[PDB]
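Lecture notes, continued. The same structure-token format from the folding unit now serves as the input rather than the output. Read the line below as a description of shape only.
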């Protein structure tokens, strides 16, 4: 509803390891007056799914309630229904997919009844993007305009398709539910076509839960795992994707992993880079690395130290009536400095430039 006068740049982090996985995450409120993102990150699932893992980002809209509920309860709604637990043995691919769909519909209905019964005043909604990782499969899950991708063999192997109201099938559903897409928005208001919550958009008489103006139905994609070739998974809200493309962010993350194995720090760098690229939204990123993720390179670390020192010297010489940081950044940009991080560019080096600037002009 409003912007802060200065961004809240404080990072909240988590990290972990297990089942042959390493992960880090970072979330940051940014320019927004409230933090309405949430996330789930768990290696080892209950009830015979110890070798399974689950990661998810939730981008809350008009409040954090739906997102916060999801982040604590979506997983059990997915795994603790009859469709997921279908077969006698390990869940089949269909069990997993049907189980995920049922879990989204059932948590949505659960929240709706909780809200009706307790006379809930919030009209919040949430996206969800995540991965359910088994020994042999990565199941991508998407509902909304948060986004996930898989980097395999140094390339974007897969990314989720954002649910935008102007997408043909989304637009069709909206119109069949009595609504319209005005520019990019449901009835000129809502920027997503799919979400949990947003119950005001789920009141069309004579249409099922998945045929409302806004649908809680997730899209699920089974990717068979590749032990040799799988590198990393990125999950993030639109606060990240609004200012960095799939290949850019994939290239950027690779460049950062070649310099560090600290996954929280890599996530911090993504979020700061997007802030400095002009993102004014809440930002959350989860980075899940597989055994063959890029490795720290002695040469990359050396190039990074050389670049940092170079930037430090440039700031000094530009300072020489001292220019402010905005103007220093502008001057550095006009220098077309080579060997900046792919995708991240000068924005990804701002913390280094600003720390230099502060040392030289501390007042
Ligand atoms: Mn939000
Ligand atoms: Mn957002």
């Amino acid at each position: 509803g409003a912007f802060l006068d200065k961004p809240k740049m404080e990072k909240h982090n988590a990290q972990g390891q297990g089942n042959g996985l390493r992960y880090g995450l970072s979330s940051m409120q940014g320019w927004r007056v409230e933090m309405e993102d949430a996330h789930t990150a768990v290696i080892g699932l209950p009830s015979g799914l110890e070798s399974w893992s689950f990661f998810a980002v939730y981008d809350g809209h008009a409040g954090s309630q739906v997102a916060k509920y999801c982040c604590e309860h979506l997983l059990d709604h997915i795994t603790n229904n009859q469709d997921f637990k279908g077969s006698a043995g390990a869940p089949s691919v269909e069990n997993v997919k049907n189980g995920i769909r049922t879990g989204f519909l059932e948590i949505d209905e659960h929240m709706r009844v909780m809200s009706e019964k307790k006379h809930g005043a919030d009209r919040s909604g949430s996206t969800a993007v995540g991965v359910l990782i088994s020994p042999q499969h990565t199941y991508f899950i998407n509902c909304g305009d948060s986004r996930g991708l898989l980097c395999r063999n140094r390339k974007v192997h897969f990314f989720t398709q954002d649910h935008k109201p102007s997408n043909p099938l989304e637009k069709e559903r909206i119109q069949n539910a009595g609504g319209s897409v005005m520019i990019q928005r449901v009835n000129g208001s809502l920027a997503v076509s799919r979400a949990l919550g947003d119950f005001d958009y789920k009141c069309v008489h004579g249409k099922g839960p998945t045929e409302q103006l806004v649908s809680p139905e997730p899209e699920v994609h089974d990717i068979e795992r590749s032990e040799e070739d799988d590198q990393f998974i990125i999950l993030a809200c639109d606060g990240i994707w609004d200012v960095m493309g799939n290949e850019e962010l994939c290239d950027f993350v690779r460049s950062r992993l070649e310099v560090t194995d600290d996954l929280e720090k890599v996530c911090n760098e993504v979020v700061d880079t997007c802030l400095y690229k002009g993102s004014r939204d809440n930002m959350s990123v989860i980075l899940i690395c597989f055994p063959n993720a890029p490795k720290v390179s002695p040469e990359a670390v050396k190039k990074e130290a050389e670049l940092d020192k170079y930037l430090e010297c440039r700031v000094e010489e530009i300072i020489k009536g001292v220019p402010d940081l905005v103007h220093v950044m502008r001057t550095l940009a006009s220098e077309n400095i080579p060997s900046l991080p792919p995708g991240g560019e000068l924005a990804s080096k701002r913390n280094v430039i600003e720390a230099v600037y502060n040392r030289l002009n501390p007042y």
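Point for the exam: The longest helix spans residues 93-117.
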